[PDB]
């Protein structure tokens, strides 16, 4: 089953790339040493072979959300919105290992090297949730394959293929957003501002005195840590139309129905990260099932046999498969 979810982020996208990146105040990424630089936390970037100029494929940077992040977003969406309410409305409860296996593929960091029986493998791949995300102590193949969230851009034209010339994007799609943390105690202004503080003016003056001592120590170092922190993070600019490729090799109809229910409940979900700055908010503007567009304003339109299958399976959903899926053979 081929599912293609074209979304539109209405907030910036921030999937933080690991690394030690810096930036000048003017906006130059990774400056040579000597000039003053601030920590930059770049967004996640996929190198893509693309056609720059004419017939000259080259590796260009295109900033994305990883398929692991979107796979866990899909997993936690169908978990918080479908699977957990189905378990709550009945008497079924999960162990902490079963909850850990359902949310992160495993209960412990150490798997057991023995694989499970063919009957249990077949029944877990027939399961609506466990078939999508087959983890556990004995590693199963989950039939859900989740691609990265690619922005519909020229740099991904060898990724996107034909049919994506509408709402086209060129050029840079990222922006460095600067964030500052000020010291609260420097923003104290009067005795009315300080009355909620134990000690008041004495404690405030002690905070200024420790900041002056630490500043003198840092000046002796240059020529603990305070609360001033001016820094930067690169985000992907809002308003982009993104492609999200979801694949299912011979799924049970309830499993693709569960993916459809999760895509229905992607409303009020954040894609990558930067929670407190409301980053990752998005609007789905299209879902195509095997190339057939099945999205409307009121969620998924059509595809009814998937929804009846997943409703019947959620009615038949229990905690027994989750418990014996997470049960280690070595334990």
């Amino acid at each position: 089953m081929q599912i293609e979810v074209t979304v539109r982020n209405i907030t910036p996208i921030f999937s933080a790339a690991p690394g030690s990146n810096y930036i000048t105040i003017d906006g130059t990424i990774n400056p040579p040493p000597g000039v003053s630089r601030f920590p930059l936390v770049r967004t996640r970037m996929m190198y893509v072979a693309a056609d720059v100029g004419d017939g000259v494929i080259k590796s260009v940077p295109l900033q994305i959300v990883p398929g692991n992040t979107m796979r866990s977003l899909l997993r936690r969406t169908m978990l918080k919105h479908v699977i957990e309410p189905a378990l709550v409305e009945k008497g079924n409860k999960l162990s902490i290992g079963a909850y850990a296996t359902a949310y992160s593929g495993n209960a412990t960091g150490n798997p057991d090297g023995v694989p499970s029986s063919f009957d249990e493998i077949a029944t877990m791949r027939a399961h609506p949730f466990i078939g999508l995300f087959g983890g556990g102590p004995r590693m199963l193949e989950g039939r859900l394959m989740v691609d990265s969230l690619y922005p519909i851009h020229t740099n991904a034209e060898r990724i996107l293929g034909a049919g994506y010339e509408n709402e086209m994007m060129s050029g840079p799609i990222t922006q460095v957003v600067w964030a500052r943390r000020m010291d609260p105690i420097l923003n104290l202004g009067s005795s009315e501002d300080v009355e909620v503080i134990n000690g008041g003016a004495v404690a405030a003056n002690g905070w200024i005195q420790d900041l002056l001592a630490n500043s003198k120590a840092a000046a002796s170092k240059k020529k603990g840590r305070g609360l001033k922190a001016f820094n930067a993070h690169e985000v992907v600019i809002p308003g982009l139309k993104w492609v999200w490729r979801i694949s299912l090799d011979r799924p049970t109809d309830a499993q693709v129905g569960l993916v459809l229910l999760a895509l229905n409940k992607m409303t009020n979900e954040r894609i990558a990260g930067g929670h407190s700055k409301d980053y990752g908010r998005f609007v789905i503007d299209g879902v195509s099932l095997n190339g057939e567009q099945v999205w409307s304003q009121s969620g998924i339109t059509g595809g009814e046999q998937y929804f009846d299958a997943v409703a019947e399976a959620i009615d038949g959903l229990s905690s027994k498969e989750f418990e014996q899926f997470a049960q280690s053979a070595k334990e």
């Binding site: 063919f118 009957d119 193949e141």
Partner: protein
């Protein structure tokens, strides 16, 4: 040897998921419930064997026409 020698890993694994699907569907008549990567049909074996880029030189007494015919084949 035009290059330094390297080592190639190759593995033999029978598809466990496809085996379970064929075993429920009846297309695989396997009475066994549990596989074994240790030994058997589902033994996921690993084997490492050397790899060299080289130029191969040999010396022999034979008609050139037949040798070039075989080596062009």
């Amino acid at each position: 040897r035009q290059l330094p020698n390297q080592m190639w890993m190759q593995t033999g694994r029978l598809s466990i998921v496809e085996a379970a699907r064929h075993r429920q569907s009846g297309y695989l008549q396997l009475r066994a419930g549990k596989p074994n990567p240790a030994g058997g049909p589902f033994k996921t074996s690993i084997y490492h064997r050397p790899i060299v880029q080289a130029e191969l030189t040999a010396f022999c007494v034979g008609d050139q026409q037949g040798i070039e015919a075989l080596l062009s084949e």
